[PDB]
Amino acid sequence: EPFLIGVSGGTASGKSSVCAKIVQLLQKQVVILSQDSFYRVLTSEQKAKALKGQFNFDHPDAFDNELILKTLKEITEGKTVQIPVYDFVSHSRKEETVTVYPADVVLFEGILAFYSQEVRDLFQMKLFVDTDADTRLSRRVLRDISERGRDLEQILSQYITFVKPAFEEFCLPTKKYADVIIPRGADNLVAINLIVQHIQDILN
C-alpha cells in the first residue's frame, strides 16, 4: 500500500513548500495532492457571497469531504484516480480533471486535512506547519492579490471575518494530532531532514 502523509497548518503557512521540500529530499515515486482541490461546487447564491468575500471557505463543510474520503481510499487501494481542478478566481470547480497514477508516497496538504477522523486515519504520518500569524496574513494577501485576482479590502475582510476565527476553531485544534509540528515551516530544514529520513527508514 502507498505511504500517505497528511500535511496541515493555517492559510499560507507554507504547507505546499514543506511538501515540495520533502519530495526534493527523498527510487521512490511521490505525488502531492492538495485538499483545496476538493472545494465543494458552489451554488449561484454561494458563489455570489464568495465574490463579496462573504463566504466561509475555511469551514469543514466548504470541502467535499465525501469525495476526499473516496479519492484517498482508492489511492490507498493502489488504484489510479482522477482529481478535480479548482479555479480560485471564479470560485468554481473546473470541468477538466487530473489523472494521478499509483505512487509509493502520497502527501495530502490542506488547512483541514486532519479534521475528519475518517480521513485522518488514512494517514500513516501527520505533520503540522506552524508559522507566525502576521507572516501568514502577509502571504495570504500577496498571493490573493497576485495569483487569485482579489482586492486588498476584500481579503482583509474575509480574513478577519472567516479565516482567523475558523483557524482558531477548526484548524488549530487539529494540531494535537500531528506526529511532528514544524515551526517556521519549509525554512526548518532540520525538522524536514529528520522527517525525510524517517520516511526513508519506514520504506526500508
Ligand SMILES: Nc1ccn([C@@H]2O[C@H](COP(=O)(O)OP(=O)(O)OP(=O)(O)O)[C@@H](O)[C@H]2O)c(=O)n1
Ligand atoms: N474559493 C476559495 C477557496 C478557498 N479560499 C481560501 O483558501 C485558503 C486555504 O488554502 P491555503 O491553505 O491557504 O493554500 P495552500 O497552498 O494549500 O497552503 P500553503 O500556502 O501553506 O502551501 C482558505 O483560507 C480559504 O479561505 C479562497 O479564498 N477562495
